[PDB]
């Protein structure tokens, strides 16, 4: 360590992380979407990796959860062309629409979080957050 | 007052979160604690609310928690009303040390003024909500 850390920094950061989760969840709930962070994560992986195998989803995170998502018409399982006993994962039209809607919710929550800052302030914040990682 | 939003901010914040999440898990594994953050959350609630019942704990965590509680019990970290054992108390304390250290290491590259500036900007964001 060079100097003791400011004792308010970890809590101030945690509060922002808390705000983002709380707001996203509240919006999802207000909007009647019945989605949890695990749901959002699963939809994102399936969209990002079309035809994802179940074990590969397992690695990046389940059979019960896919069953739920399939029943809600968000995910479709197709047989693996080489292995008829296993299934690969795809978003339905509805599941894709919901994934992209969830993404727009997340970006709006961030926009609303940051918009009270002036452009100079926002740029300073980017720099400081980046400084934490760059080093 | 609402300004246009810098498109680097959400990714910058997300990157910090993901870095910290990864580092905490790496340090828990480095110390062979065999815990994940949800496990520590259970231990922390049991520590803070010593004697609370299983149903109550389950609700606060928000079958599957009973599985985790049973796993923590099988490791003699939790005893039965729920209490941390001596081993559970020690491992919870060690996890907290790790959480604190990872955050110290996160903010280390910032000078005291940078640290104070970051506190202020994070506060300003929140206060306007």
């Amino acid at each position: 360590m060079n100097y003791p850390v400011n004792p308010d920094l970890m809590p101030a950061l945690m509060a922002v992380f808390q705000h983002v989760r709380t707001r996203i969840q509240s919006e999802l709930d207000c909007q009647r979407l019945d989605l949890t962070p695990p749901d959002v994560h699963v939809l994102k992986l399936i969209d990002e990796q079309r035809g994802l195998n179940l074990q590969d989803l397992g690695r990046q995170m389940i059979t019960r959860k896919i069953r739920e998502l399939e029943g809600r018409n968000l995910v479709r399982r197709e047989r693996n062309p080489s292995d008829q006993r296993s299934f690969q994962l795809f978003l339905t039209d509805e599941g894709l629409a919901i994934h992209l809607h969830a993404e727009l919710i997340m970006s709006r929550v961030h926009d609303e979080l940051f918009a009270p800052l002036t452009p100079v302030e926002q740029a300073t914040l980017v720099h400081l957050l980046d400084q934490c990682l760059a080093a | 007052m609402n300004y246009p939003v810098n498109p680097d901010l959400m990714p910058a914040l997300m990157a910090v979160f993901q870095h910290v999440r990864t580092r905490i898990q790496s340090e828990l594994d480095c110390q062979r604690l065999d815990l994940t953050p949800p496990d520590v959350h259970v231990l922390k609630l049991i520590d803070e609310q010593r004697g609370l019942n299983l149903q109550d704990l389950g609700r606060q965590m928000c079958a599957l928690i009973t599985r985790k509680i049973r796993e923590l019990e099988g490791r003699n970290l939790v005893r039965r009303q729920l209490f941390l054992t001596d081993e559970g108390l020690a491992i919870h304390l060690h996890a907290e040390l790790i959480m604190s250290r990872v955050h110290d290491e996160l903010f280390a590259p910032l000078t005291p003024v940078e640290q104070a500036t970051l506190v202020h900007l994070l506060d300003q964001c929140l206060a306007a909500q």
Binding site: M14, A15, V20, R21, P38 | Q18, I24, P38, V40, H41
Partner: peptide
């Protein structure tokens, strides 16, 4: 016990939960 004071305290308390489950 002001707004951001309370949020900081609550968030610090929930740190394991927040890193354990998030949309990030």
């Amino acid at each position: 016990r002001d707004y951001t004071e309370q949020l900081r305290r609550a968030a610090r308390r929930n740190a394991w939960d927040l890193y354990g489950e998030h949309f990030y």
